[PDB]
Every structure is written in structure tokens, then in C-alpha cells.
Design a protein around this motif. Structure first.
Motif, PDB file in Angstrom:
ATOM      1  N   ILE A 150       8.757  38.687  -7.816  1.00 60.57           N
ATOM      2  CA  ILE A 150       9.923  39.556  -7.751  1.00 60.57           C
ATOM      3  C   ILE A 150       9.786  40.474  -6.544  1.00 60.57           C
ATOM      4  O   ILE A 150       8.802  41.211  -6.428  1.00 60.57           O
ATOM      5  CB  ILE A 150      10.080  40.374  -9.048  1.00 60.57           C
ATOM      6  N   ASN A 151      10.769  40.422  -5.646  1.00 62.25           N
ATOM      7  CA  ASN A 151      10.827  41.332  -4.504  1.00 62.25           C
ATOM      8  C   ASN A 151      11.401  42.643  -5.022  1.00 62.25           C
ATOM      9  O   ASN A 151      12.614  42.846  -5.073  1.00 62.25           O
ATOM     10  CB  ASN A 151      11.658  40.737  -3.375  1.00 62.25           C
ATOM     11  N   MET A 152      10.497  43.546  -5.413  1.00 61.73           N
ATOM     12  CA  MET A 152      10.863  44.648  -6.298  1.00 61.73           C
ATOM     13  C   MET A 152      11.892  45.574  -5.658  1.00 61.73           C
ATOM     14  O   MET A 152      12.888  45.940  -6.294  1.00 61.73           O
ATOM     15  CB  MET A 152       9.606  45.431  -6.684  1.00 61.73           C
ATOM     16  N   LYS A 164      28.816  40.297  -5.475  1.00 55.33           N
ATOM     17  CA  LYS A 164      28.661  38.914  -5.898  1.00 55.33           C
ATOM     18  C   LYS A 164      27.932  38.844  -7.235  1.00 55.33           C
ATOM     19  O   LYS A 164      27.378  39.832  -7.723  1.00 55.33           O
ATOM     20  CB  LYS A 164      27.899  38.109  -4.842  1.00 55.33           C
ATOM     21  N   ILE A 165      27.948  37.649  -7.831  1.00 60.17           N
ATOM     22  CA  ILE A 165      27.240  37.428  -9.089  1.00 60.17           C
ATOM     23  C   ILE A 165      25.745  37.639  -8.900  1.00 60.17           C
ATOM     24  O   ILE A 165      25.044  38.117  -9.807  1.00 60.17           O
ATOM     25  CB  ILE A 165      27.548  36.021  -9.631  1.00 60.17           C
ATOM     26  N   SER A 166      25.235  37.279  -7.720  1.00 57.27           N
ATOM     27  CA  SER A 166      23.816  37.436  -7.433  1.00 57.27           C
ATOM     28  C   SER A 166      23.365  38.872  -7.633  1.00 57.27           C
ATOM     29  O   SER A 166      22.275  39.107  -8.156  1.00 57.27           O
ATOM     30  CB  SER A 166      23.513  36.981  -6.006  1.00 57.27           C
ATOM     31  N   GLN A 208       7.515  41.309   0.653  1.00 56.85           N
ATOM     32  CA  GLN A 208       8.001  42.685   0.652  1.00 56.85           C
ATOM     33  C   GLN A 208       7.684  43.379   1.969  1.00 56.85           C
ATOM     34  O   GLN A 208       8.592  43.828   2.677  1.00 56.85           O
ATOM     35  CB  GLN A 208       7.399  43.453  -0.523  1.00 56.85           C
ATOM     36  N   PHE A 256      19.545  33.027  -2.804  1.00 52.55           N
ATOM     37  CA  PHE A 256      20.338  34.236  -2.611  1.00 52.55           C
ATOM     38  C   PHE A 256      20.764  34.404  -1.160  1.00 52.55           C
ATOM     39  O   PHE A 256      21.915  34.764  -0.888  1.00 52.55           O
ATOM     40  CB  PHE A 256      19.550  35.462  -3.074  1.00 52.55           C
ATOM     41  N   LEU A 306      15.233  44.656 -16.567  1.00 51.32           N
ATOM     42  CA  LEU A 306      14.220  44.067 -17.437  1.00 51.32           C
ATOM     43  C   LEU A 306      12.814  44.339 -16.917  1.00 51.32           C
ATOM     44  O   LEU A 306      11.912  44.672 -17.693  1.00 51.32           O
ATOM     45  CB  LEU A 306      14.463  42.565 -17.579  1.00 51.32           C
ATOM     46  N   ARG A 307      12.606  44.199 -15.605  1.00 44.90           N
ATOM     47  CA  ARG A 307      11.253  44.265 -15.063  1.00 44.90           C
ATOM     48  C   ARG A 307      10.714  45.690 -15.087  1.00 44.90           C
ATOM     49  O   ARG A 307       9.528  45.910 -15.360  1.00 44.90           O
ATOM     50  CB  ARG A 307      11.230  43.697 -13.645  1.00 44.90           C
ATOM     51  N   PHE A 344      25.721  31.808  -6.864  1.00 44.82           N
ATOM     52  CA  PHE A 344      25.204  33.140  -6.568  1.00 44.82           C
ATOM     53  C   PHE A 344      25.979  33.798  -5.436  1.00 44.82           C
ATOM     54  O   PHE A 344      26.356  34.972  -5.535  1.00 44.82           O
ATOM     55  CB  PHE A 344      23.720  33.067  -6.218  1.00 44.82           C
ATOM     56  N   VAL A 364      22.971  35.096 -15.903  1.00 47.74           N
ATOM     57  CA  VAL A 364      21.952  36.124 -16.100  1.00 47.74           C
ATOM     58  C   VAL A 364      20.883  35.624 -17.062  1.00 47.74           C
ATOM     59  O   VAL A 364      19.679  35.767 -16.812  1.00 47.74           O
ATOM     60  CB  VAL A 364      22.598  37.432 -16.590  1.00 47.74           C
ATOM     61  N   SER A 373      28.921  33.337  -4.594  1.00 53.43           N
ATOM     62  CA  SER A 373      30.308  33.570  -4.956  1.00 53.43           C
ATOM     63  C   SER A 373      30.493  35.000  -5.460  1.00 53.43           C
ATOM     64  O   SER A 373      29.619  35.550  -6.133  1.00 53.43           O
ATOM     65  CB  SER A 373      30.752  32.582  -6.029  1.00 53.43           C
ATOM     66  N   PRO A 374      31.624  35.624  -5.149  1.00 51.08           N
ATOM     67  CA  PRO A 374      31.883  36.979  -5.638  1.00 51.08           C
ATOM     68  C   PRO A 374      32.325  36.982  -7.094  1.00 51.08           C
ATOM     69  O   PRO A 374      32.787  35.980  -7.641  1.00 51.08           O
ATOM     70  CB  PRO A 374      33.007  37.469  -4.722  1.00 51.08           C
ATOM     71  N   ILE A 375      32.168  38.149  -7.721  1.00 49.56           N
ATOM     72  CA  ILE A 375      32.641  38.333  -9.086  1.00 49.56           C
ATOM     73  C   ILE A 375      34.160  38.255  -9.100  1.00 49.56           C
ATOM     74  O   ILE A 375      34.840  38.961  -8.344  1.00 49.56           O
ATOM     75  CB  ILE A 375      32.146  39.672  -9.652  1.00 49.56           C
ATOM     76  N   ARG A 404      14.068  45.318  -2.984  1.00 51.21           N
ATOM     77  CA  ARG A 404      15.407  44.831  -2.666  1.00 51.21           C
ATOM     78  C   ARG A 404      16.234  44.709  -3.944  1.00 51.21           C
ATOM     79  O   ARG A 404      17.411  45.095  -3.984  1.00 51.21           O
ATOM     80  CB  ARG A 404      15.296  43.498  -1.921  1.00 51.21           C
ATOM     81  N   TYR A 405      15.602  44.215  -5.013  1.00 51.82           N
ATOM     82  CA  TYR A 405      16.212  44.226  -6.338  1.00 51.82           C
ATOM     83  C   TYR A 405      16.597  45.639  -6.748  1.00 51.82           C
ATOM     84  O   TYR A 405      17.678  45.863  -7.308  1.00 51.82           O
ATOM     85  CB  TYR A 405      15.230  43.643  -7.356  1.00 51.82           C
ATOM     86  N   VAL A 456      24.620  40.994  -9.741  1.00 53.86           N
ATOM     87  CA  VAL A 456      24.567  41.251 -11.178  1.00 53.86           C
ATOM     88  C   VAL A 456      23.267  40.719 -11.766  1.00 53.86           C
ATOM     89  O   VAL A 456      22.579  41.410 -12.538  1.00 53.86           O
ATOM     90  CB  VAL A 456      25.796  40.640 -11.874  1.00 53.86           C
ATOM     91  N   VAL A 457      22.907  39.484 -11.409  1.00 56.44           N
ATOM     92  CA  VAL A 457      21.632  38.931 -11.858  1.00 56.44           C
ATOM     93  C   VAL A 457      20.484  39.806 -11.377  1.00 56.44           C
ATOM     94  O   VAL A 457      19.514  40.052 -12.103  1.00 56.44           O
ATOM     95  CB  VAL A 457      21.468  37.480 -11.375  1.00 56.44           C
ATOM     96  N   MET A 458      20.592  40.292 -10.143  1.00 56.21           N
ATOM     97  CA  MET A 458      19.563  41.141  -9.559  1.00 56.21           C
ATOM     98  C   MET A 458      19.397  42.430 -10.352  1.00 56.21           C
ATOM     99  O   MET A 458      18.272  42.862 -10.631  1.00 56.21           O
ATOM    100  CB  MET A 458      19.954  41.444  -8.117  1.00 56.21           C
ATOM    101  N   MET A 473      20.223  43.012 -13.521  1.00 57.10           N
ATOM    102  CA  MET A 473      19.626  42.743 -14.827  1.00 57.10           C
ATOM    103  C   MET A 473      18.135  42.445 -14.712  1.00 57.10           C
ATOM    104  O   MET A 473      17.344  42.876 -15.560  1.00 57.10           O
ATOM    105  CB  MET A 473      20.365  41.605 -15.524  1.00 57.10           C
ATOM    106  N   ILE A 474      17.730  41.720 -13.667  1.00 58.76           N
ATOM    107  CA  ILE A 474      16.310  41.451 -13.465  1.00 58.76           C
ATOM    108  C   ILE A 474      15.551  42.750 -13.224  1.00 58.76           C
ATOM    109  O   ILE A 474      14.454  42.952 -13.758  1.00 58.76           O
ATOM    110  CB  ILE A 474      16.109  40.449 -12.312  1.00 58.76           C
TER     111      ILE A 474
END
Lengths: 254, 218, 212, 212, 72, 42
Positions: free
Chosen positions: F3-5, F28-30, B67, D57, F40-41, D102, D34, D104-106, F7-8, F32-34, F36-37
């Protein structure tokens, strides 16, 4: 061997017959083989190297041209190369011009930009100029000896089934041979069409096609520089500085 | 002093502002060298210099940044430019620098060798392999469109012209004409076979012209 | 921290091309320029060369003044970098090449140029012909000449065996490019316009010669 | 609070596909990604795998350094997740697959890709043919060979009875996809260009063979 | 890994079965041929697990064991 | 730390600002995962 062909028309029993001699087709096929032309060029180069060897000229050409003190070796090398090229053009005369003199140039101040070997008449005898630093710079330049210039299947099938001449030395020999070939073309125009035509050719190489094809194209062998088609990379872009709204009615050189 | 620090610094500011944000004026290679020299020479920009240098090839990486490292990179880059940015700005600037560093530079002309004659290799080839290879070669060519004026088959029903051509070619024996045509066809075929280093099948060429007996018998 | 070895190799290759000391035609990118400049800066004994090439950024700032010992030391540095002769005109070629590379804009396709702006007397080929012809006629001839062409089949067979693995096309490429580069460098050094029409017409003459 | 079981099942299926350890073709959505990432984070003994896949990422951040015990433990963790052999190249396949997923775009329609960026020496099929042929010729043969085709009607009847309920089309699909995936993984691991023209031409050859 | 005879016999029998399917007159395959089993990627062919070669004296068949194991 | 808090956190801010209000750039999908993470966190 001969092959016979018969033509028959449906109006009669007449048959007209022609005989073909296969030797012509065999000669064309042999001339179409890459290995054949490669062997021809390599055999010319090997004959050149053997000719140098029997004249004691075994030292690498770069080392010969790097020796400032010993001029006799440089003069002998250039004369032998000229004689070899002359014999290649005319396979009847083994001795070159029986008398000619050599002058070696070591200065830019008296150097010709692009014609390292030049010829002149001193009203008494032929004189040949040799630009030693130019030839040294030519032969000493590092060569691209790992890149490939464009059969894998035969290699795959095979896999499933003493003078030390390096590549650099052979490339140096070929370089000197081509340079002396250019010089000899200039010298041939000189000897056969006068000093005026020689100095006209020095500034315009396009006269070679007219002053060679009249006699050389039907009597001598193929020239060494004709083995490959050479072009300058992006020639049109660089030449764009000199463009003419032209009308060429005597395009004697395509 | 070997480095004119401030002029390098403004050059780097301009270049990085252009690449990072203004993805859409023009700059020279000298400015790119200048920016990299500034990034290397300035102590606090070493991380950014390494991150951009990783774009030179495809076998270079960066250790995962913690970080505090990413905040240090961020406020360093912000000091380079007050506008708010994030790691996405770093990513787009890195991609722009990757595109830039792969741009070719000026080179001197070279003598390019072209094959004078399509010289074939030692091993003889059959008609089938030759056909495959030549078809692959033809595939790479650029076809040209031909548009006829109309669909109707060309023809001529002018009697006078027809009997006149017939009279002009009347004294011309059919035997000699057909013999000349067949023999020139055969000679050209054999010449192409010889030049191509391809085996000539005499039986196939004979079978070509058996429609004579096919017509006569049936 | 940077990798001295990779930067040194990139600098070596780029300088080999930009000094016209090699015919190796490898596509050079901006990254190679960055590496060569960074290596030149970092290495202590290449500081003179780095400053020399960095002065080329502005066309109005010309070559720094160096005393003879400095020029000799820089020549030794260039020789060591190339591990190869090398003299002042090589440094001039390098300076001109790097100046034109730096002042060139970033572009997607490699720009093909010819050697220029090296070495007052802007001349052409014919005036040089006359002048150097007179100067050569001044020079005294050294050797006066007043021929075995052996066809020893075994010897030619051994020579062919030695030459056989060599890719003839590569040898021709090397020889032709060497002649072209020597001619271009002689033209540029002599401050004479290099007419590539004539040089290309040489090849055109060969091509027209063959087919007859 | 999250459902460990559902997330574990989604992770299991997605990793099975992304490791090329299964031919089960189920349309995977972003929700499965996810769930797999969340489960990887939450489970204590999958922290190494979660960090490994999260490093993907950014393309510039490559694989974390792991000592041999850590790699062995992660291999055991992957084996336990899949309850299946599994080795380092499986982890490399998973890393490449998740990196490409990851970055890849949505998008509305599933993107069909081929395995790439796994395992310096960028080769083609023919150079590999020559090299591995020489290497195989080096290897000493193990067994030297210097045939019953029984048509026992009752035995073949029992064999057909056992095989009869099997949906032949499913067996062919499984076999063909298995061969395709093994070939693609061998190509990618060997850093050799996979020419799908040739592989599709295999099927085209079969199709042309049948109708004659 | 240890027992190579079974792998060689299996591959030879499969080849003979396919040969008989093509030519329903020859029950015995090539009367003499040798087998070499490959366990390394370093000497593996990407896409042709079973390969054939001539050692100038006898047919030789290569079997990429890890590839077949990964398949099955 | 796994977790890199921060940037997430910014990734989640951007994604949720895009989805909630700007129903009309691309992600990107990344991310979206980010998001949701992060949800949750936190």
C-alpha cells in the motif's frame, strides 16, 4: 455487333427504329478501365526504356548524370528523350531537328530556377541548355517507396483459391521523361510561335492551354503529366498572400 | 559548454507552470524542446523526464514507483515551481504534455495526386453490387435542404397559354418526340453502364416499358 | 537514460524531410523534434549540428563561425546520419527549416509552408532569365548534333512484366514532388520569388489539356 | 474487521463479469469494486492479483514483472477464486477491464463499453482474412470424409419432456451472448477492429429474413 | 485434443442437419469434404470459427477448436 | 509493502473533504476505492 431499338406509340402501328453500334460503348468501357490507362502509361515508359537500351543507355540515369567528364552521354540522353516526346506528339517524324547543339551547366550562377532544360537561338542553330546539378539533385533525392497511395476482396478470394529495374530506376526514368516533356512544350511554343512567345511562356505557363489545344488537343495523344490531377497541399492558405478582389472576364484557364 | 543552463531552466519553469496548473498564455515548440532538454540534463529530474517521455507513444510504461520515489518526484516538481501539489497535478501535467507532444509540426508542401476519372476495375460488376457501392458513396455526401414556398401542387389553368402552347407544339409529331426521348434515355443508360463496367440486362430494360401492354390489355 | 536507436531514427526521418532530401510525407509531431534535438545533443560527433540548430532559437543569433575542417566534419556527420549530394546548401536548408519550426507556436494542425530565407540580391524570374541567358550564351557548347524507336514485342512485354508490380501512382507522386522540391530549392537558393500561381497553373494547363 | 465471505462473493461475481467468463448480467455498483479490491488486499494469496489490479490506477504504470512460477501461482489463485480454460489472456482481459473501470469517473448510469486494449500490429478484418487463410492452407487436413435423421416419436417425446422445463428465451440469451463475447474477445486479442455494424447487421439480416 | 474424428463428425453432422432443415429432400450432405482443426490464435479468424475454402480439389472446412471450447 | 500509504491518504482527504463539506469537482471510482482502503488500513 449492332443493337436495334423500336419505339411504338398508342395511336397507330407505326414503329420508328434506330440502330446502335456496340463498338462505341465497348471503346468507352475500355477507356474507363484503370488497368487500360495504367497499361498505356507503363507501355509508354517501357518504350522509353527500350529506346534508351538500344542506344546503349543501360546505365542508370542518375549515374549518367553524375558523370561530369562524359558530356556526350548526357547530350544523347536529352536529345533521345526530346525525340521520343516529339514522336509521341507527331507519330510521323522519327528523327528530331536534324541539327542542334548542347551546353551543360554545372553552376548555380548560370542556372534557371525551375526550367532545367532551356532552348535558345544563337542566330545560327538551336542550342539546348542542360542544368546537370539540378537533374542530379532531382534523380538522387530519396523516394517514398513504402507508402501506399489511395481490391482487398479479390486478393482475399485469390488467397482462399532480365534487366534488373528497381522502382527507384523507373521513378527516375519517369522524372526525366516528365521534365523533358515540360521542356518540349516550351520548345514547341518556341518553334511554332517565335522567341517572343517562348520567353513570354517561360514567365507565364498559362499560355500553354491556348497554344496547345488549338492543334495538339485534337491530333496527338494524351500528355504524360495529364495522367493524374496534381495539386499543392494547402494551396489556398499559401496563396492567401496574393489575393485579388477579381473580376475575371477572360478566365481561359479554369 | 553546450547548454545555456539558466535560460533553459526558466523556460522549463514557465512551461511546466503553464501546463500543470494553468490548464486554460501561448508557447512555441522551442520551449517544449527546451523543457525536455532541461529535464534530461538536470540529474534530479530524470524520473520526471522519463514520465513525460512515456507520453511519446502508447507502447511505453513506467515501473511502479515506491513511496520514497513519489516524494522525490513531488519535491523536485515543487522546486520547479511553494504551492502545494500532489500526484493529481503530476497526472494533469502529464496529460497536457501528452496532448502537446502529439501536436503536428510544420511541414513543407507536397504535390497531392487526385484521381482524374473514376476508373473502374477489370472485374465486371452487376447492377446490385454497383447499387450497394454507389449508395455507400452517396451516404458520405452532405444533403441540402429544399423548402418550397407552399404545400400546394404547382399548376396552371390559364386557358389562353395552354391552347397557345398546344398550337405551337401541334405540328410536332408524337412519334418522333417519344422516339427521341426514349432513345436519348437508352443511350445515356447504356453509356453509364459501359463507363461503370456494369453488365447491362436487356430484359430488365425491356420490362421497364411493358406498362404499354398492361394498360392496353386491362 | 534514453534509447539512442529510436531517437536516431526520429532524427534521421525529421532531418530527411527538413533537408528536402526525401519526398516521404509522414506527419511529424513535436515529439520528433524533441527526439532529434536530444539525440543531436547526446551524440558527441553531432555537437556541431546541435549547436547550429540550437542557435536558431533567436532570430538575431546567426550561424556560428566554423573553419573549413569543421564544416567538412559536419558535412561528413550529416552524410553519416542520412547514410546517402550533401553540401553547404543542404545545411542552409536544414537551418532555415529548423528555425521556422522552432519559432512556430504549438498548434493543433500541421502548418504548411514553403522554403524561404536561404542563401542579398532579391530578384524576380525575368531578371534572372536575362542574366542567366547571357551567362549561358557566354558558355561554349560542348557537343554538336548533326533514331531507333524499336517496337520489339517480346522486349516490351518483358519490360512491362518488370514494371507491372510498380504502383504507377506512387511513381507519379515521387516524380512530381521531386520536380516541385527541386524547383522550390532552386528558387529559394537563387533568392527569386517562387510564384506558386505559375506552378499550379502548370497542373491546371495539363488538366485543361486532357479534357479536349 | 470485514466479512470475508461477502467480500469474496462480490469479488467472485465482479471478476466473473470482468473476465468475460460468464454471461450473468447483474448491475454492478461501486460497492462491488470496493469489496473486490479490499478482499484482494486482505487475502494473502491474492496479493499478486491485488497489486496487478492496483497498478492500473495510472495508465503509465504497467504490469509488474512476474517470473513463470509467479504467473502460474496467480493463475491457480484466479482459478480457485472462480472455482471453474483460464490462462494469460484472461488475466489481460481482467487487467484492461479493471483499468477502464478505475479510470472511469463516478456517474449515475452504468457505462456500456466494449473490450479493448489487450494483447502492436493494429490490423483489420480483411488482412487477417488473407493471412490466416494462407496459414490455414498451410495446415494439413486431419480427417477426410467421403446420414440418420431418425424421427422416433417416443424418443423425441422423451427429449421434449426433458427440455420442456427449460426457458427457451434464457437458452437463446445465453447462446447469443456467448457467441458475442467469444467474437469480441477474438477480435480484441487479434488486435483487429471489431465492427459492431456488421454484428448488428447479422441480427438485422435474421429479422429481415423472418418476415418474408 | 487428441481425437479429431469426433469433432469432424460432430461439425459435419450439424452442417448436414442444417442443410436438411433448409432443403427437406437431401439427407446426405456434400458427399466429400475435408476437415482441419485449428488450435492456435496465430491462424484463427476473429468471429467465424467455422470457415470453408476450396483447395482446387475438394471442399475444406476449418474448425477453431479453442474458440468453440471457450464458447461452450 | 503493498500500500502506497501517503498517496492513498491524500486521495482520502480530498474525497472526504469533497463529500462532507463541498456537497455541490469530480472524482473517479479509483479514488473511492482508495479512500476505503485508507480507512481500513489506518
Amino acid at each position: 455487333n449492332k443493337v436495334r431499338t423500336v419505339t411504338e406509340i398508342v395511336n397507330s402501328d407505326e414503329k420508328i427504329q434506330k440502330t446502335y453500334e456496340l463498338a462505341e460503348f465497348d471503346l468507352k468501357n475500355l477507356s474507363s478501365l484503370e488497368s487500360y490507362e495504367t497499361l498505356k502509361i507503363k507501355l509508354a515508359l517501357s518504350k522509353y526504356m527500350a529506346m534508351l537500351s538500344t542506344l546503349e543507355m543501360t546505365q542508370p540515369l542518375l549515374e549518367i548524370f553524375r558523370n561530369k567528364a562524359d558530356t556526350r552521354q548526357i547530350a544523347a540522353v536529352v536529345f533521345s528523350t526530346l525525340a521520343f516526346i516529339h514522336n509521341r506528339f507527331h507519330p510521323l517524324v522519327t528523327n528530331f531537328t536534324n541539327k542542334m547543339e548542347f551546353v551543360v551547366t554545372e553552376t548555380n550562377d548560370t542556372s534557371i530556377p525551375g526550367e532545367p532544360i532551356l532552348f535558345t537561338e544563337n542566330e545560327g542553330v538551336l542550342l539546348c541548355s542542360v542544368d546537370r546539378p539540378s537533374i542530379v539533385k532531382m534523380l538522387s533525392r530519396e523516394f517514398d517507396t513504402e507508402a501506399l497511395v489511395n481490391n482487398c476482396n479479390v486478393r482475399i478470394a485469390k488467397t482462399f483459391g532480365d534487366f534488373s529495374i528497381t522502382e527507384v530506376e523507373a521513378t527516375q526514368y519517369l522524372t526525366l521523361l516528365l521534365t523533358v516533356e515540360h521542356a518540349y512544350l516550351h520548345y514547341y511554343i518556341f518553334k511554332n510561335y517565335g522567341v517572343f512567345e517562348y520567353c513570354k511562356s517561360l514567365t507565364d505557363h498559362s499560355l500553354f492551354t491556348n497554344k496547345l489545344r488549338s492543334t495538339m488537343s485534337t491530333k496527338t495523344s494524351n500528355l504524360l503529366l495529364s495522367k493524374f490531377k496534381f495539386t499543392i497541399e494547402d494551396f489556398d492558405k499559401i496563396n492567401s498572400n496574393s489575393v485579388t478582389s477579381g473580376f475575371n472576364i477572360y478566365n481561359f484557364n479554369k | 559548454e553546450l547548454i545555456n543552463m539558466r535560460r533553459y531552466r526558466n523556460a522549463a519553469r514557465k512551461l511546466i507552470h503553464h501546463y500543470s496548473l494553468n490548464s486554460t498564455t501561448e508557447y512555441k515548440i522551442s520551449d517544449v524542446v527546451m523543457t525536455m532538454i532541461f529535464l534530461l540534463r538536470s540529474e534530479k529530474y530524470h524520473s520526471l523526464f522519463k514520465l513525460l517521455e512515456t507520453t511519446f507513444d502508447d507502447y511505453t510504461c513506467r515501473p511502479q514507483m515506491t513511496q520514497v520515489q513519489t516524494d522525490t518526484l513531488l519535491d523536485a516538481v515543487r522546486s520547479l515551481l511553494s504551492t502545494t501539489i500532489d500526484l493529481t497535478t503530476v497526472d494533469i501535467m502529464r496529460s497536457s504534455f501528452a496532448r502537446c507532444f502529439n501536436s503536428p509540426i510544420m511541414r513543407y508542401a507536397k504535390i497531392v495526386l487526385l484521381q482524374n476519372v473514376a476508373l473502374q476495375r477489370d472485374k465486371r460488376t452487376t447492377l446490385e453490387e454497383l447499387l450497394i457501392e454507389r449508395g455507400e458513396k452517396i451516404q458520405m455526401l452532405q444533403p441540402q435542404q429544399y423548402i418550397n414556398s407552399g404545400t400546394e401542387i404547382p399548376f396552371c389553368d390559364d386557358a389562353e397559354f395552354l391552347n397557345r402552347l398546344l398550337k405551337h407544339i401541334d405540328p410536332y409529331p408524337l412519334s418522333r418526340m417519344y422516339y427521341n426521348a426514349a432513345n436519348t434515355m437508352f443511350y445515356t443508360t447504356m453509356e453509364n453502364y459501359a463507363v461503370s463496367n456494369c453488365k447491362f440486362n436487356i430484359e430488365d430494360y425491356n420490362n421497364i416499358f411493358k406498362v404499354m401492354e398492361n394498360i392496353r390489355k386491362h
